[PDB]
Design a protein around this ligand. Structure first.
Ligand code: DGT
Ligand code: DGT
Ligand code: MN
Ligand code: MN
Lengths: 178, 174
DNA sequence: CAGGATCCT
DNA sequence: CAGGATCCT
């Protein structure tokens, strides 16, 4: 909200800096968050020229760690403060090159990954259309899975691309989703 | 600000004839559709606020009742306001007090009254007991496997006894 | 469309 | 225990 606007390139340099610097405390132990479990989402992934904030999705190996990842987040040698922080969303105000920016951290479990990536990539208008179409065929789609009568629909997929095509829609790269 | 029980009762009495909503038309809220709930109904000597449940004749009016609430002969402001809860800061005498307005549909009335009467500790026990027999109780109804359990009850007393619990007057619930 | 964190009810 | 309003995501 109050955070400064970033250029796409500014955002990419922040993500790159953070890729090696995130960690969390787990019952005392300090566990590094692997760069490969950090997916850049939001307008940055859609490669928009200006961004209101930086959105990172964190992929967590086991459900037991959800309690601990965002609520005990750490960033090596970066000045920041917490706006709000639960298990699924944490909003930080970070200091970067003498400016204050909003950094949004989200968590997905490994089995949720492609649904999460699809959700947090957006844009909002695109997701409303996609979900409404699935709603007319009696499905509910969210960031956790595809559902039918409050029951998980177990799709045999791994990637976002595979998800979208399994949902019965045309795949477009993030940049071309409107 | 904190109220005595009697202060609270005089506020409710004043408001009983003064609530209305728009909606183009201005519709009076009947005193008989206004139930005092919360610690006032439990007759606690001191209260943190005044809680009133408003009973709505039809579901189509939910959109309009609290979101277009009006009070004749009173100065106030809205804190927050949705279809189910509206919180007002009212001027009474020479003081500011919190007034909480809740809505229940007619078919929900006894569930709402039971919920908003409390106290919280009592409701947690009651609901946990029903949870062990696979029911869910809330302010809207009694449910089983995401299906409304159609008890044909009218009053709160009838509800509690139908739920299989001992009826106690609000003052003695704990 | 769908859901999350906060601070309540 | 179970859920609501606000302002986000
Ligand atoms: N389903 C759904 N998802 C949303 C909604 N708002 C945001 N999201 C998801 C998709 C977004 O790409 C992601 C990040 O939200 P942001 O508000 O940061 O928007 P985005 O990053 O797209 O642009 P911006 O930060 O404004 O440059 O969260 C919503 O109303 N519904
Ligand atoms: N199920 C449930 N009901 C609640 C909860 N908190 C409040 N309520 C309901 C029952 C309460 O009697 C009613 C009014 O809440 P209040 O916070 O105003 O407490 P109460 O009025 O009993 O005392 P006070 O207002 O503090 O004098 O709302 C809760 O956590 N769970
Ligand atoms: Mn963003
Ligand atoms: Mn109260």
């Amino acid at each position: 909200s109050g955070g400064g606007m970033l250029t796409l390139i500014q955002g990419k340099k922040i993500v790159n800096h953070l890729r090696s610097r995130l960690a969390f405390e787990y019952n005392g132990q300090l566990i590094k968050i692997l760069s490969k479990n950090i997916v850049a989402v939001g307008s940055l992934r859609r490669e928009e020229k200006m961004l209101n904030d930086v959105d990172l999705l964190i992929i967590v190996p086991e459900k037991k760690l959800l309690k601990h990842v965002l609520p005990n987040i750490r960033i090596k040698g970066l000045s920041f403060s917490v706006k709000v922080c639960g298990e699924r969303k944490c909003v930080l105000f970070i200091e970067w090159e003498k400016k204050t920016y909003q950094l949004d951290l989200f968590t997905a479990l490994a089995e949720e990954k492609p649904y999460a990536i699809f959700h947090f990539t957006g844009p909002v208008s695109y997701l409303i259309r996609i979900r409404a179409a699935l709603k007319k065929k009696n499905y509910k789609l969210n960031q956790y899975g595809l559902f039918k009568n409050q029951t998980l629909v177990p799709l045999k997929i791994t990637t976002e691309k595979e998800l979208i095509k399994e949902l019965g829609f045309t795949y477009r790269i993030p940049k071309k989703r409107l």
